[PDB]
Amino acid sequence: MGAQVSTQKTGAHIIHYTNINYYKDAASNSANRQDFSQDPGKFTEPVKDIMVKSLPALN
Amino acid sequence: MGAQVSTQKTGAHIIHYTNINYYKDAASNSANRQDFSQDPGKFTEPVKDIMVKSLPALN
Amino acid sequence: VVEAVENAVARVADTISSGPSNSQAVPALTAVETGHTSQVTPSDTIQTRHVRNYHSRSESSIENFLCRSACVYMGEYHTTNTDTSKLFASWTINARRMVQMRRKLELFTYVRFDMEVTFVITSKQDQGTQLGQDMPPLTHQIMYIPPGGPIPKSVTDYTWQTSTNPSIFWTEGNAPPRMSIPFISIGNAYSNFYDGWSHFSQNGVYGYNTLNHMGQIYVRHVNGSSPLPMTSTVRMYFKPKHVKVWVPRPPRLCQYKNASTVNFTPTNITEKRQSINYIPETVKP
Amino acid sequence: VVEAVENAVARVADTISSGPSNSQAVPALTAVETGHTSQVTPSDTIQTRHVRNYHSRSESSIENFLCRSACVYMGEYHTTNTDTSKLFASWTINARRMVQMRRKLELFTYVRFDMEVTFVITSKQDQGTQLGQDMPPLTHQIMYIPPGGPIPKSVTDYTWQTSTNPSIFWTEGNAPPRMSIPFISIGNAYSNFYDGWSHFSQNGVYGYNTLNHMGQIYVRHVNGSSPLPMTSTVRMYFKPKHVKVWVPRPPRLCQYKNASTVNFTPTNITEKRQSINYIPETVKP
Amino acid sequence: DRVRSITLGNSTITTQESANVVVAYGRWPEYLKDNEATAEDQPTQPDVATCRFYTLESVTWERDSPGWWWKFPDALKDMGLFGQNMYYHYLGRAGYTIHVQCNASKFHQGCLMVVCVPEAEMGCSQVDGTVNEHSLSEGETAKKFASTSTNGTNTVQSIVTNAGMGVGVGNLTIFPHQWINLRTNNCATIVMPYINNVPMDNMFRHHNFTLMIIPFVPLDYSSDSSTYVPITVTVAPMCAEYNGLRLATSL
Amino acid sequence: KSCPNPGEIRNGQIDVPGGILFGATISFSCNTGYKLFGSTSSFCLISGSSVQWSDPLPECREIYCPAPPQIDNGIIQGERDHYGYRQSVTYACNKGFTMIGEHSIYCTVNNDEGEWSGPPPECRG
Amino acid sequence: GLPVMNTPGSNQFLTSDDFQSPSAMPQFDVTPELNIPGEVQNLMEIAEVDSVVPVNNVEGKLDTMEIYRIPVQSGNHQSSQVFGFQVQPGLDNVFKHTLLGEILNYYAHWSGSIKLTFVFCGSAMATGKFLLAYAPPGANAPKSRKDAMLGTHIIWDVGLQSSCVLCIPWISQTHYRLVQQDEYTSAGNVTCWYQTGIVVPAGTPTSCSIMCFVSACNDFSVRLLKDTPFIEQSALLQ
Amino acid sequence: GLPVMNTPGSNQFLTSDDFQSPSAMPQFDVTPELNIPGEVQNLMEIAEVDSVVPVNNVEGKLDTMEIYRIPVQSGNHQSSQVFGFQVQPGLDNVFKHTLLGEILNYYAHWSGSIKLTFVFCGSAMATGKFLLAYAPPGANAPKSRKDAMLGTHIIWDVGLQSSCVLCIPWISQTHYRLVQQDEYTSAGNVTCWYQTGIVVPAGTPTSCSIMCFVSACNDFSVRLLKDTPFIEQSALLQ
């Protein structure tokens, strides 16, 4: 009835849960604890020219 | 089971909510906070002949 | 069976670009004598850049504006007294004793809506010499007397049998008592204003009191008397749902005097400044 | 209608095998002068075995990190007093009076999020000579005063009619009062920091106080006075949901002084050891 | 690989021992687009009169010298037609290109950190006090850190190790930065987009960012190497708009 | 009219809360570890053919801890004068003696006066 | 029965919540609707209507119709400023009681542009040209027409079409502006000066009057409902 | 109505629960997002950034920039150890205040490998070779280069490319390690020795400096959120 069945957090080495929203406002939802994304090269490698990890950093 | 899944209020720059009515009377429903309509020309321009915003208001 | 409802969002108009102009099109010169309000977007007077405008006029619709609860009456009643008419509260229904929701509703001449009514009932032990007792939770009855029914004369009346009048029993400590009310009127819209009389000889009572007769409300303590006095205060909250409104009016300026009439004292239009040219200088080291 | 949502789990990178090497590829020699952080996995410096790595960086995402409730204000108010301004609590809203959530939020310069606000309100009977009474359950009102509304002057004010300000009535003994709050800001992100003034003459107030004006909160006992004094303490808990964050900053080192400014006393970088060569000997019979 | 040239406006910069170019967060300066904009009127975009290389006076790296900081803008406010549009206009937006230039021989040694800090809100010397504006910025004259904890009313607590913001001065590597290691390079370049939480923002009120130059490893030399080693800073706006014209401000 | 630029007190600080225009005062301070020999404030007054500063710039001269208190049955590794702020003094015991306590004392400044740390060590027989 | 579990916020009364609730009059039969003229469907339809602006609200003229009309005369008065007032549609005494102002004062933020329409109310033979200028904030109000000339202005020629619209555009950094404006979200100030002056033949009066009508453009919006400070009581039955 | 039945854990307030909750500002219209540069999406992106490490944190140098630089000189100093410190990225005073350390101290377990990058900061004509060794735990720290030679080491030749990365791999039995490390989950210790020494021509200084930057490899992870011991107050308004 407007549901959504997503996957639970299980470890690696009957796992689906159900969500329904009741309120008219997205500021009433749960938290988005299941988005895991990254882009460290933004802070780790913020340089104009690339550096290829097996060539001298200069030269 | 007699439901209706409408859209939430999100800003611009998982958003559907579910409604079911339980009572036998429409005076028991929620409020219609998601109808946005307008017609200002009723109060703003209540004149017999039109005025076209780039011609003199007279003449 | 699930049904998908479509809800369109109404943004406000974007700003179209513009450039220089040298033409006989005068979008500025007009004539207010026609009772017409100029439609001059900024892009008509100056050079504007294209601006996608995402703002919305949602929280200013009439439903979003009015559908908020507000108190419209406060009344006190005692468990024990020596008056027998202070043991229960009673009042005729109108939204007109509190200035806030009154003034809010009175930007329009005819308002047609359902309501959601809530009651906040709070008892206190009366100050005295010998306090201390074990009284059980108080429970209250709220009866609605439509126009015509018999009205109570004591808290031990027969009328509180509420055979057909609707009434609520609520035992203190729970969530407030709330219910919903249709458009209980005989006109086709609640008329906030009325320029007329009741009698055809052009006399009688003038204005609002003529039109709207919606009956009374009577609140009481069901429990019984009390070893030591206590006093309860009931506040009533109206929240209009499914709201339709017609013929807007200028907001009230002068302060309200009574709930019967629109009588007033004359007030100034606005408050003064030093001159007509006065803008304060605020960029100063 | 059921909808299946796909949730991908982000493991950390496995260890690829390696062998001897004799080449002109120097994955170790670099130059930090370029503002670039070397990417040298162990398999570049030594001989590693293939290791399927199942670990996850889930509990370190920003949503998992910040979305935990934390107290941000504690305030007391009495049922009866001789001050009439200690009968209700009041405070301007900021996350900046408690060091824990302050320092937590202040690893980033701009934080944009919704919140889930909870209140923990706990009354105690004030110590005195003549205790003993039967007071009913206390109920409390929590009003939010946006920036501009009229603020109360007593617990019997008119403002507590809360016609448009949102406010919560809660009768002690139930689950705490919780509600949810959107991104109520005029910028495009809450700016934890601000290197600037309010007035254009480059003076005024410096830093955070300039930017963020979110109004006040006022808490009171609805019941009324009390035969014998009692005092209630309200704690407010913020939990940011739907969290977005920008421009990280080094964590604070020196202790906080006040909630207005970032003023501090200088502290040491870190604590001392005996020498620069000192490692303690812990394998000893 | 080490040679480089940067041509902005009617100005050029040549360099022969450059390490690389930090682009702040992988992001280049750009103009305000139509859907992220909030002001109605048409902006000025002078484009060659304002987006060029303005050179601030240079500081002498001594053997015992804690560091230096500048605040941008309010450093370029008396520089040409950037510092004039910046007067006549209410709202301004721009990114920058900061080129720091310090050269020494092969018998000298040292190491500077060159770091751009967004919203570098600073802390007064008396903990229960308020900074001045002079104590945050002298224009094109740099303010100087101190090797010990400073005193005096209204003046930033400018002991180097805390960098005046209350953090650790070695963690500043989280911000866009470079080093000048007098054994490898002799210039650092940081390309800094417009980082702020509103689309455009006033230019006299808000010090959009702070440039700190902090020698971690100090100077040194032997018998008669050159005693005088200066540092020169060049800043060049990029994609500079202004909006909201009226009569000129005054301070 | 504007007075000439105040200047720069090294190991110190100049606080100009109201500009350098006519009749504007400025204050002088010295960092932690230096004593201020000179004037404390300076005004923008009329000087002959211009407006200049009331008082010249002062000097922040280093605060010194006194010579470290010697210990019996002990020795100091290369004892020196001019023990400024944050500088150290290392002790040692002699043949047949055992060292107790802080084996080295570091000079700090308290109340604007140089002061060593806790007492030097002891040498037991 | 079903195992439920009550979350915080249970058994509270939040003034601005919309739940369902039992009808106390079941199977009521409401009165058929009526197509009464003039139905409002938004409040920004009451704020796009012109409203005479009490500009001349000096003391001694606040309960007079004279508060509504700006005095203008003939002669060499080019040094004098006709009028001037801050742009504060919810806080300035000039605006806070218009339709725009009284509608704003129920809200806490406002964005959009404004339309000020001026009506020359003198003879049919008087002729003049006026300069109407808006100055985005950042510097003190202009004190001469050479400074007002630099703003965002219009030059209104008085002729057959009597009135002229100065549309104050939306120049701001924040997408919105408080209604209780401070000097962070300041908005500017408008000022009016003679461009050539008033010229009248013989036998017509020399002292004429202007009037100013404020309305909101088609991109105005208000948000964050609040209470209005303009109504107040001291007991029930009021 | 429906028969429900309340389970234990009802009407409690668990700090780390995520339920839905009524909006106190219904139909609010939030400010449009802005593509502000530099958005963080994880905390292991702040811990993969280099950070200067206060190795020389002897007493008397803790509030000096001298804490950051390792002294190195020319001559027959092969018997002397340059530096050495335990591997305890959340507890050792050398590490607990880096970006890696300050990010770890919000968590209770940590796994992964670490990258220590050394920067020679002397003349452009000084030349030396250094030995940088990591010793997995099990035996006291090496006290001679013949023992450090047996570890997991690297020999860094100082030349054009100034800096050199010693990547401390992850050798452990437990998949994770406490942040408040004990001698069960000990991690080892690193130590640095001259391999040939420093050689300088005439007219260059003899006393040079190294510096050490710590960062986390691309397989690092932390878990079990906790509070950080580094911030503390003694009353509200702080």
Coordinates of N, CA, C and O in Angstrom, one line a residue, chain D residues 10-106:
Chain D
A10 N 29.3 -1.2 0.5 CA 30.6 -0.8 0.0 C 31.6 -1.4 0.9 O 31.9 -0.9 2.0
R11 N 32.3 -2.5 0.4 CA 33.4 -3.1 1.1 C 34.6 -2.2 0.9 O 34.6 -1.2 0.2
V12 N 35.7 -2.6 1.6 CA 37.0 -2.0 1.4 C 37.8 -2.8 0.5 O 37.6 -4.0 0.3
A13 N 38.9 -2.3 -0.1 CA 39.6 -2.9 -1.2 C 40.4 -4.1 -0.7 O 41.1 -4.0 0.3
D14 N 40.3 -5.2 -1.5 CA 41.1 -6.4 -1.2 C 42.6 -6.1 -1.3 O 43.0 -5.1 -1.9
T15 N 43.4 -7.1 -0.9 CA 44.8 -7.0 -1.0 C 45.2 -7.9 -2.2 O 45.1 -9.2 -2.0
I16 N 45.7 -7.4 -3.3 CA 46.1 -8.2 -4.4 C 47.5 -8.8 -4.0 O 48.3 -8.2 -3.3
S17 N 47.8 -9.9 -4.6 CA 49.1 -10.6 -4.3 C 50.2 -9.8 -4.9 O 50.0 -8.8 -5.6
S18 N 51.4 -10.2 -4.6 CA 52.6 -9.5 -5.1 C 53.8 -10.5 -5.0 O 53.7 -11.5 -4.4
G19 N 54.9 -10.1 -5.7 CA 56.1 -10.9 -5.7 C 57.3 -10.0 -5.6 O 57.2 -8.9 -5.3
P20 N 58.5 -10.6 -5.9 CA 59.7 -9.8 -6.0 C 59.5 -8.8 -7.1 O 58.7 -8.9 -8.0
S21 N 60.4 -7.7 -7.0 CA 60.3 -6.7 -8.0 C 61.7 -6.1 -8.2 O 62.5 -6.1 -7.2
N22 N 62.1 -5.8 -9.4 CA 63.4 -5.2 -9.7 C 63.1 -4.3 -11.0 O 63.3 -4.8 -12.1
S23 N 62.8 -3.1 -10.8 CA 62.3 -2.3 -11.9 C 62.5 -0.8 -11.6 O 63.0 -0.5 -10.5
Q24 N 62.2 0.0 -12.5 CA 62.3 1.5 -12.3 C 61.0 2.1 -11.9 O 60.9 3.3 -11.9
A25 N 60.1 1.3 -11.5 CA 58.8 1.8 -10.9 C 59.0 2.0 -9.4 O 59.2 1.0 -8.7
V26 N 59.0 3.2 -9.0 CA 59.1 3.6 -7.6 C 57.8 4.0 -7.0 O 57.5 5.2 -7.1
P27 N 56.9 3.1 -6.6 CA 55.7 3.5 -6.0 C 55.8 4.2 -4.6 O 54.8 4.6 -4.1
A28 N 57.0 4.2 -4.1 CA 57.2 4.8 -2.8 C 57.7 6.2 -2.8 O 57.1 7.1 -2.2
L29 N 58.8 6.5 -3.6 CA 59.3 7.8 -3.8 C 58.2 8.8 -4.3 O 57.6 8.5 -5.4
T30 N 58.0 9.9 -3.7 CA 57.0 10.8 -4.1 C 57.4 12.3 -3.8 O 58.6 12.5 -3.6
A31 N 56.5 13.2 -3.8 CA 56.8 14.6 -3.5 C 55.6 15.2 -2.9 O 54.7 15.6 -3.6
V32 N 55.6 15.4 -1.5 CA 54.4 15.9 -0.8 C 54.3 17.4 -1.1 O 53.3 18.0 -0.8
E33 N 55.3 18.0 -1.8 CA 55.2 19.5 -2.1 C 54.0 19.8 -3.0 O 53.6 20.9 -3.2
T34 N 53.4 18.7 -3.6 CA 52.3 18.9 -4.6 C 51.0 19.0 -3.9 O 50.0 19.1 -4.6
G35 N 50.9 18.9 -2.6 CA 49.6 18.8 -1.9 C 48.8 17.5 -2.3 O 47.6 17.6 -2.5
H36 N 49.5 16.4 -2.4 CA 48.9 15.1 -2.9 C 49.3 14.0 -2.0 O 50.5 14.0 -1.6
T37 N 48.4 13.2 -1.6 CA 48.6 12.2 -0.6 C 48.9 10.8 -1.2 O 48.0 10.3 -1.9
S38 N 50.0 10.3 -1.0 CA 50.5 9.1 -1.6 C 49.5 7.9 -1.5 O 49.0 7.7 -0.4
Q39 N 49.2 7.2 -2.6 CA 48.4 6.0 -2.6 C 49.3 4.8 -2.7 O 49.4 4.2 -3.7
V40 N 49.9 4.4 -1.6 CA 50.8 3.2 -1.6 C 50.1 2.1 -0.8 O 50.3 2.1 0.5
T41 N 49.4 1.3 -1.4 CA 48.9 0.1 -0.7 C 50.1 -0.8 -0.3 O 51.2 -0.7 -0.9
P42 N 49.9 -1.6 0.7 CA 51.1 -2.4 1.2 C 51.6 -3.3 0.1 O 52.9 -3.5 0.0
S43 N 50.8 -3.7 -0.9 CA 51.3 -4.6 -1.9 C 52.3 -3.9 -2.8 O 52.9 -4.6 -3.7
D44 N 52.5 -2.6 -2.7 CA 53.6 -1.9 -3.4 C 54.9 -1.9 -2.7 O 55.9 -1.8 -3.4
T45 N 55.0 -2.0 -1.4 CA 56.2 -2.0 -0.7 C 56.7 -3.3 -0.3 O 58.0 -3.5 -0.2
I46 N 55.9 -4.3 -0.1 CA 56.3 -5.7 0.4 C 55.6 -6.7 -0.4 O 54.9 -6.4 -1.4
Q47 N 55.8 -8.0 0.0 CA 55.1 -9.1 -0.7 C 53.9 -9.5 0.1 O 54.0 -9.9 1.2
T48 N 52.7 -9.3 -0.5 CA 51.5 -9.6 0.1 C 50.8 -10.8 -0.5 O 51.0 -11.2 -1.6
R49 N 49.9 -11.4 0.3 CA 49.0 -12.5 -0.1 C 47.7 -12.0 -0.4 O 47.2 -11.0 0.1
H50 N 47.0 -12.6 -1.3 CA 45.6 -12.2 -1.7 C 44.7 -12.3 -0.5 O 44.6 -13.4 0.0
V51 N 44.0 -11.3 -0.2 CA 43.2 -11.2 1.0 C 41.8 -10.6 0.6 O 41.8 -9.5 0.3
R52 N 40.8 -11.5 0.6 CA 39.5 -10.9 0.3 C 39.0 -10.2 1.6 O 39.0 -10.8 2.7
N53 N 38.7 -8.9 1.4 CA 38.5 -8.1 2.6 C 37.0 -7.7 2.6 O 36.5 -7.1 1.6
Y54 N 36.3 -8.1 3.6 CA 34.9 -8.0 3.7 C 34.5 -6.8 4.6 O 33.3 -6.5 4.7
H55 N 35.4 -6.1 5.2 CA 35.1 -5.0 6.1 C 34.3 -3.9 5.3 O 34.4 -3.8 4.1
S56 N 33.6 -3.1 6.1 CA 32.8 -2.0 5.5 C 33.0 -0.7 6.2 O 33.2 -0.7 7.4
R57 N 33.0 0.4 5.5 CA 33.0 1.7 6.0 C 31.6 2.3 6.2 O 31.3 3.3 5.7
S58 N 30.7 1.5 6.8 CA 29.3 2.0 6.9 C 29.1 2.8 8.2 O 28.5 3.9 8.1
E59 N 29.6 2.4 9.3 CA 29.4 3.2 10.5 C 30.3 4.5 10.6 O 30.3 5.1 11.6
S60 N 30.9 4.8 9.5 CA 31.7 6.1 9.4 C 31.2 7.0 8.4 O 31.7 8.1 8.2
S61 N 30.1 6.7 7.7 CA 29.5 7.7 6.8 C 29.0 8.8 7.6 O 28.9 8.7 8.9
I62 N 28.6 9.9 7.0 CA 28.2 11.1 7.7 C 26.9 10.9 8.4 O 26.6 11.4 9.5
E63 N 26.0 10.2 7.7 CA 24.7 9.9 8.3 C 24.8 9.0 9.5 O 24.1 9.3 10.5
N64 N 25.6 8.0 9.4 CA 25.7 7.1 10.6 C 26.5 7.8 11.7 O 26.3 7.4 12.9
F65 N 27.3 8.8 11.4 CA 28.1 9.4 12.4 C 27.3 10.5 13.2 O 27.3 10.5 14.4
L66 N 26.6 11.3 12.5 CA 25.9 12.4 13.1 C 24.5 12.1 13.6 O 24.0 12.6 14.6
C67 N 23.8 11.2 12.9 CA 22.4 10.9 13.3 C 22.4 10.1 14.6 O 22.1 8.9 14.6
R68 N 22.7 10.7 15.7 CA 22.6 10.2 17.0 C 22.2 11.4 17.9 O 22.8 12.4 17.8
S69 N 21.2 11.2 18.8 CA 20.7 12.3 19.6 C 21.8 12.7 20.6 O 22.6 11.9 21.1
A70 N 21.8 14.0 21.0 CA 22.7 14.5 21.9 C 22.1 15.7 22.6 O 21.4 16.5 21.9
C71 N 22.3 15.9 23.9 CA 21.7 17.1 24.6 C 22.4 18.4 24.2 O 23.6 18.4 24.0
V72 N 21.6 19.4 24.1 CA 22.2 20.7 23.6 C 21.7 21.9 24.5 O 22.2 23.0 24.3
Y73 N 20.9 21.6 25.5 CA 20.5 22.6 26.5 C 19.8 21.9 27.7 O 19.1 21.0 27.5
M74 N 20.1 22.5 28.9 CA 19.4 22.1 30.2 C 19.0 23.3 30.9 O 19.8 24.2 31.2
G75 N 17.7 23.4 31.2 CA 17.2 24.6 31.9 C 16.1 24.2 33.0 O 15.3 23.3 32.8
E76 N 16.1 25.0 34.1 CA 15.2 24.7 35.2 C 14.1 25.8 35.3 O 14.4 27.0 35.0
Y77 N 13.0 25.4 35.8 CA 11.9 26.3 36.0 C 11.0 25.8 37.2 O 10.8 24.6 37.3
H78 N 10.5 26.7 38.0 CA 9.8 26.3 39.2 C 8.3 26.5 39.0 O 7.8 27.4 38.2
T79 N 7.5 25.7 39.7 CA 6.1 25.9 39.7 C 5.7 27.2 40.4 O 4.8 27.9 39.9
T80 N 6.3 27.5 41.5 CA 6.1 28.7 42.3 C 7.4 29.3 42.6 O 8.4 28.6 42.9
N81 N 7.5 30.6 42.6 CA 8.7 31.4 43.0 C 8.2 32.8 43.3 O 7.0 33.1 43.3
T82 N 9.2 33.7 43.7 CA 9.0 35.1 43.9 C 9.7 35.9 42.9 O 10.2 37.0 43.2
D83 N 9.8 35.4 41.7 CA 10.6 36.1 40.7 C 9.7 36.3 39.4 O 9.9 37.2 38.6
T84 N 8.8 35.3 39.2 CA 7.9 35.3 38.0 C 8.6 35.2 36.7 O 7.9 35.1 35.7
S85 N 9.9 35.2 36.7 CA 10.7 34.9 35.5 C 11.5 33.6 35.7 O 12.1 33.2 34.7
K86 N 11.4 33.0 36.9 CA 11.9 31.7 37.1 C 10.8 30.7 37.1 O 11.1 29.5 37.3
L87 N 9.6 31.1 36.8 CA 8.5 30.1 36.6 C 8.5 29.6 35.2 O 7.6 28.7 34.9
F88 N 9.3 30.0 34.3 CA 9.4 29.4 32.9 C 10.8 29.5 32.4 O 11.6 30.4 32.8
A89 N 11.2 28.5 31.6 CA 12.5 28.5 31.0 C 12.4 29.1 29.6 O 11.4 29.2 29.0
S90 N 13.6 29.6 29.1 CA 13.6 30.3 27.9 C 15.1 30.3 27.4 O 16.0 30.5 28.2
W91 N 15.2 30.2 26.1 CA 16.6 30.2 25.5 C 16.6 30.4 24.0 O 15.7 29.8 23.4
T92 N 17.6 31.1 23.5 CA 17.8 31.1 22.0 C 18.4 29.8 21.6 O 19.1 29.2 22.3
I93 N 18.0 29.4 20.4 CA 18.4 28.1 19.8 C 19.7 28.2 19.2 O 20.0 29.0 18.2
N94 N 20.6 27.3 19.6 CA 21.9 27.0 18.9 C 22.4 25.7 19.5 O 22.1 25.3 20.6
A95 N 23.2 25.0 18.7 CA 23.8 23.7 19.1 C 25.1 23.9 19.9 O 25.9 23.0 20.0
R96 N 25.3 25.1 20.4 CA 26.6 25.6 20.7 C 27.0 25.7 22.2 O 28.0 26.3 22.5
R97 N 26.1 25.3 23.1 CA 26.4 25.4 24.5 C 26.9 24.1 25.1 O 27.5 24.1 26.2
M98 N 26.8 23.0 24.4 CA 27.4 21.7 24.9 C 28.5 21.4 23.9 O 28.4 21.4 22.7
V99 N 29.7 21.0 24.5 CA 30.9 20.9 23.8 C 30.9 19.6 22.9 O 31.5 19.6 21.8
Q100 N 30.1 18.6 23.3 CA 30.2 17.3 22.5 C 29.7 17.5 21.1 O 30.4 17.3 20.1
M101 N 28.4 17.8 21.0 CA 27.8 18.0 19.7 C 28.3 19.2 19.0 O 28.4 19.2 17.7
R102 N 28.7 20.2 19.7 CA 29.4 21.3 19.0 C 30.6 20.8 18.3 O 30.7 20.9 17.1
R103 N 31.6 20.3 19.0 CA 32.8 19.8 18.4 C 32.5 18.8 17.3 O 33.2 18.7 16.3
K104 N 31.5 18.0 17.5 CA 31.2 17.0 16.5 C 30.7 17.6 15.2 O 31.2 17.3 14.1
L105 N 29.8 18.6 15.3 CA 29.3 19.3 14.1 C 30.4 20.1 13.4 O 30.3 20.4 12.3
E106 N 31.4 20.5 14.2 CA 32.4 21.5 13.7 C 33.6 20.8 13.1 O 34.7 21.3 13.3

